[PDB]
Design a protein around this ligand. Structure first.
Ligand SMILES: [K+]
Ligand SMILES: [K+]
Ligand SMILES: [K+]
Ligand SMILES: [K+]
Ligand SMILES: [K+]
Ligand SMILES: [K+]
Ligand SMILES: [K+]
Ligand SMILES: [K+]
Ligand SMILES: [K+]
Ligand SMILES: [K+]
Ligand SMILES: [K+]
Ligand SMILES: [K+]
Ligand SMILES: [K+]
Ligand SMILES: [K+]
Ligand SMILES: [K+]
Ligand SMILES: [K+]
Ligand SMILES: [K+]
Ligand SMILES: [K+]
Ligand SMILES: [K+]
Ligand SMILES: [K+]
Ligand SMILES: [K+]
Ligand SMILES: [K+]
Ligand SMILES: [K+]
Ligand SMILES: [K+]
Ligand SMILES: [K+]
Ligand SMILES: [K+]
Ligand SMILES: [K+]
Ligand SMILES: [K+]
Ligand SMILES: [K+]
Ligand SMILES: [K+]
Ligand SMILES: [K+]
Ligand SMILES: [K+]
Ligand SMILES: [K+]
Ligand SMILES: [K+]
Ligand SMILES: [K+]
Ligand SMILES: [K+]
Ligand SMILES: [K+]
Ligand SMILES: [K+]
Ligand SMILES: [K+]
Ligand SMILES: [K+]
Ligand SMILES: [K+]
Ligand SMILES: [K+]
Ligand SMILES: [K+]
Ligand SMILES: [K+]
Ligand SMILES: [K+]
Ligand SMILES: [K+]
Ligand SMILES: [K+]
Ligand SMILES: [K+]
Ligand SMILES: [K+]
Ligand SMILES: [K+]
Ligand SMILES: [K+]
Ligand SMILES: [K+]
Ligand SMILES: [K+]
Ligand SMILES: [K+]
Ligand SMILES: [Mg+2]
Ligand SMILES: [Mg+2]
Ligand SMILES: [Mg+2]
Ligand SMILES: [Mg+2]
Ligand SMILES: [Mg+2]
Ligand SMILES: [Mg+2]
Ligand SMILES: [Mg+2]
Ligand SMILES: [Mg+2]
Ligand SMILES: [Mg+2]
Ligand SMILES: [Mg+2]
Ligand SMILES: [Mg+2]
Ligand SMILES: [Mg+2]
Lengths: 163, 197, 258
RNA sequence: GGCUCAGGACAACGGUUGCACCCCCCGUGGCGGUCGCCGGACACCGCUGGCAACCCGGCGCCAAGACGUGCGCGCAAGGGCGGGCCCCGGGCGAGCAGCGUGACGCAGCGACGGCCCGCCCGGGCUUCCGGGGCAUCACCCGGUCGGCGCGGUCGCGGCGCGCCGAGGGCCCGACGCCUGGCGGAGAAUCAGGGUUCGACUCCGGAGAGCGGGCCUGCGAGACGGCCCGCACAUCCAAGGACGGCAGCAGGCGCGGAACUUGCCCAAUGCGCGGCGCGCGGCGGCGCGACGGGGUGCGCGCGAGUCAGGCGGG
């Protein structure tokens, strides 16, 4: 079926290369999960056993505000930005590294301490916080992440500027 | 032939056979599916059948003709030779129509039901002989080696908690504790050693 | 292929087994266990081929079913069990106890040993590593594992193990001037003293040794086994790890038919 | 394990590296802490059937070292913080591996105690050098060369996809075409230097009429497993069912050219432990080829014949 064997590529001088065997089982690939937002995780048997979890339709995650170290479990509300393609944002597909809006309720108990980023407290004062997925949902069936801060936060806030 | 109707009564345990024209016309039985009630005034619940050429009915195909299907190991109408082997086969002569040369039927809620067949085999599991005789399945004298069976090759009760088997299990537990105790002592020795060093 | 190899042609068997090229298409294939395929000997090749206690394969099996053979104190009922360097070989009904070492031609020999010696074993520390919940472990040349080792034991040292408890009672450090024996290569089997250790960043570390007659030789650090501290902790064959030259070997051969 | 050499020329293959990018049954050491004896049902089998034969149907009593659920001192995968701001032991040449701490999660092992860890053999890819002929084949390539991000995989990688740039190779022979092209260890010839061939014994690779696809398993893109298209055959009541000798013998065809449709697991080994095995062994045919001795000597032998040994399953 799908293979990641290199026998089908040209050489580095552009030359066509011949075929000297048929497809081997250990060189197979599978189709991607295309994990949707808003709960199923399928099981995949792999080489030697070694179960892989493959998520479809995740809703929640566990998130960390690293600087003050406030970790809760929160609901992922919307995929807002993706580096690879804007098609992956329009569909709310969950992949590693995409920028999301998560629910502000679990972190409202963190509204009291000052000397805590006002670029995070003002986020909390509303309805959602900007965060980033840090796991591979197709390989482990899970979608967790961290809360953006620093120059990264500003870079993505200008990427989502109302312009 | 025309149609051999294998009736089978499980309330008593008997099996009987009949015949019928079952030709192309009205036949108030036609158009019914497997696991359906009919009123049996011409011969009750259908459970299977073979058509001409002896192809068996298959549940769910929802057709009155034959069909091919990729049957998988564990399913009916197929006996595999290797683990994981599948096979394409032909099935389902009708949802009962004129084609069938045989029908299989069971009787519900009762020529008339007369014979009562004995049960050849007797209960074997240890609990199977305590539900029969109303005995409790919770005591410290569960031995139950009554030997009657009415001399009816089959007994050798299973799942009996004897004395030696009780000792065996207790011994295994008493060693599964010794491992943990010695392991914790060794860990303590090593921690103290690094403390001295 | 599509999976592991279970056969071994006779011409493809290791050359120090001294198998003869007629009398068989096949050779025994050693089972996995304490020793690897190349640096071992199948147990059958000692009982039938060498000592003639058995004379065929089938009657070599029945000796090992009724458990007349102990390896390191345990009865092994498997004819292709891999026995190797430093394994204790004791047959009780004939009262024979041996230690398995190398001779000066890289072949396995059995050295008679006393009942006061067969209760311990020398192992080579192959690696130290952290296992489960961060605990330290050491691994040897026998596929043996020891948890919570004393912090002094480092890699390339040798340890001494009682053969009933399976615990450590002594260790020898790898140093300059230690007595050593080479376990493989082309100086396999001969015994000397370490006089150099040259490390090469990224690559193999070479060891220079010198025999008791003063002959010097070299090999890789993965082939030098410490047998004591200026005195071997065990018994060694009569030749004591001195290798003749081809001329002196020829004169000793001429003298046997003489 | 056995067979073959069709494909494939910066492949494969040979020596030489690496995985701090990996997976691994059995065996041999370890290790073993997990938020009162349960259930019902399947085959063999009984009673009845269908069918030309291939193959199956229905009802019913019955077990487990089979399942399923589980009694238990919390800990499987993945994730956020915990490094030093000339230059440099747990373990390295190399900041690697563990642990702590906040959040998720609830996996695996428990109804005869094993999840897990090291080794071992095996595999996957991978560094450097070697790796056919033709110039009446001089320019070639466009996922082609590099970058960024995700996916997929046992795993790295243009392996795939989106976006960005214009690279990459060449008379030290690229690209294209051809080969009655499997590679090595080796073999034939013979002062020294060379020439020619590498079907077949060992090692490695690839295939099972030709394309593809896949399940079960630690391991297969398996063909003495399954599914489909094509080209060919097989039985048949005409409804259907069904095949793969480049395994061992044997046959047809083709060619200048190549043997018995034998006996046996006694040996050498392999799977389960007592058997199995056309691996392999023993006979048969065999002027391909090798080695030894005769058709006399001055008077004793061999080739045959018949018996007993020895040998041999
Ligand atoms: K594939
Ligand atoms: K494969
Ligand atoms: K199968
Ligand atoms: K092969
Ligand atoms: K395998
Ligand atoms: K195998
Ligand atoms: K051989
Ligand atoms: K041989
Ligand atoms: K051979
Ligand atoms: K073996
Ligand atoms: K052949
Ligand atoms: K070929
Ligand atoms: K295997
Ligand atoms: K390579
Ligand atoms: K290379
Ligand atoms: K290479
Ligand atoms: K090269
Ligand atoms: K040319
Ligand atoms: K492109
Ligand atoms: K890429
Ligand atoms: K692309
Ligand atoms: K481009
Ligand atoms: K050329
Ligand atoms: K050819
Ligand atoms: K010459
Ligand atoms: K020449
Ligand atoms: K020459
Ligand atoms: K010449
Ligand atoms: K040949
Ligand atoms: K071959
Ligand atoms: K070959
Ligand atoms: K070979
Ligand atoms: K081979
Ligand atoms: K091979
Ligand atoms: K081969
Ligand atoms: K192959
Ligand atoms: K082919
Ligand atoms: K084929
Ligand atoms: K084919
Ligand atoms: K094919
Ligand atoms: K195929
Ligand atoms: K494999
Ligand atoms: K395939
Ligand atoms: K295929
Ligand atoms: K045949
Ligand atoms: K052929
Ligand atoms: K034959
Ligand atoms: K002819
Ligand atoms: K002819
Ligand atoms: K045999
Ligand atoms: K096996
Ligand atoms: K044969
Ligand atoms: K004579
Ligand atoms: K004679
Ligand atoms: Mg193939
Ligand atoms: Mg929109
Ligand atoms: Mg199978
Ligand atoms: Mg093979
Ligand atoms: Mg461009
Ligand atoms: Mg060749
Ligand atoms: Mg060849
Ligand atoms: Mg041949
Ligand atoms: Mg095969
Ligand atoms: Mg195939
Ligand atoms: Mg001819
Ligand atoms: Mg002669």
């Amino acid at each position: 079926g799908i293979t990641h064997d290199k026998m089908y590529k040209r050489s580095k001088t552009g030359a066509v290369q011949g075929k000297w065997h048929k497809k081997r089982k250990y060189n197979l690939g599978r189709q991607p999960a295309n994990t949707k937002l808003i709960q199923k995780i399928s099981t995949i048997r792999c080489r030697g056993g070694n179960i892989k979890r493959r998520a479809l339709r995740l809703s929640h995650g566990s998130f960390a505000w690293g600087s003050a170290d406030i970790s809760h479990k929160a609901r992922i509300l919307q995929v807002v930005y993706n580096s690879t393609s804007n098609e992956l944002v329009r569909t709310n597909t969950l992949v590693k590294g995409c920028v999301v809006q998560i629910d502000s309720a679990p972190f409202k108990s963190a509204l009291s301490n000052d000397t805590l980023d006002k670029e995070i407290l003002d986020q909390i004062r509303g309805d959602h916080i900007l965060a980033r997925i840090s796991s591979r949902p197709g390989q482990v069936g899970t979608a967790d992440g961290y809360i953006l801060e620093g120059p990264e936060l500003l870079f993505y806030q200008k990427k989502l500027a109302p312009k | 032939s025309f149609c051999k109707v294998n009736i089978s009564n499980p309330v008593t345990g008997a099996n009987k056979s009949l015949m019928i024209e079952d030709f192309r016309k009205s036949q108030t039985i036609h158009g019914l599916r497997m696991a359906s009630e009919f009123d049996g005034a011409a011969l009750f619940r259908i459970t299977g059948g073979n058509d001409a050429q002896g192809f068996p009915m298959y549940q769910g195909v929802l057709k009155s003709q034959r069909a091919r299907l990729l049957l998988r190991q564990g399913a009916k109408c197929y006996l595999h030779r290797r683990n994981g082997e599948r096979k394409r086969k032909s099935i389902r002569g009708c949802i009962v129509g004129p084609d069938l040369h045989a029908l299989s039927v069971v009787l519900v809620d009762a020529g008339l039901t007369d014979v009562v067949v004995p049960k050849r085999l007797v209960p074997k599991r240890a609990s199977k002989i305590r539900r029969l005789f109303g005995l409790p399945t919770t005591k410290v004298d569960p031995k139950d080696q009554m030997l009657v069976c009415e001399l009816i090759l089959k007994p050798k009760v299973q799942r009996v908690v004897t004395d030696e088997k009780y000792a065996r299990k207790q011994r295994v537990i008493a060693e599964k504790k010794e491992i943990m105790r010695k392991s914790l002592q060794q860990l303590e020795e090593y921690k103290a050693l690094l403390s001295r060093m | 292929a599509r999976g592991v190899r279970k056969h071994l042609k006779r011409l493809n068997a290791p050359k120090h087994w001294l198998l003869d090229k007629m009398g068989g298409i096949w050779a025994p294939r050693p089972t996995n266990g304490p020793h690897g395929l190349r640096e071992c000997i199948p147990l059958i090749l000692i009982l039938r081929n060498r000592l003639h206690y058995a004379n065929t394969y089938a009657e070599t099996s029945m000796i090992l079913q009724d458990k007349n053979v102990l390896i390191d104190g345990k009865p092994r009922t498997d004819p292709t069990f891999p026995v190797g360097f430093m394994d204790v070989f004791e047959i009780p009904k004939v009262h024979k106890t041996f230690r398995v070492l190398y001779d000066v031609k890289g072949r396995f020999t059995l050295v008679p040993i006393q009942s006061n010696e067969a209760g311990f074993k020398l192992c080579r520390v192959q690696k130290i590593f952290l296992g489960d919940k961060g605990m330290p472990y050491l691994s040897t040349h026998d596929a043996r594992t020891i948890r919570f080792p004393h912090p002094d034991i480092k890699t390339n040292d040798t340890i001494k193990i009682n053969l009933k408890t399976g615990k450590i009672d002594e260790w020898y450090k790898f140093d300059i001037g230690k007595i050593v024996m080479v376990t493989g290569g082309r100086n396999c089997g001969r015994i000397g003293t370490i006089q150099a250790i040259d490390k090469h960043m990224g690559s193999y570390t070479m060891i220079r040794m010198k025999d008791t007659e003063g002959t010097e030789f070299l090999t890789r650090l993965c082939n030098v086994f410490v047998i004591g501290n200026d005195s071997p902790a065990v018994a060694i064959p009569t030749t004591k790890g001195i290798r003749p030259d081809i001329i002196k070997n020829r004169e000793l051969r001429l003298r046997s038919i003489a």
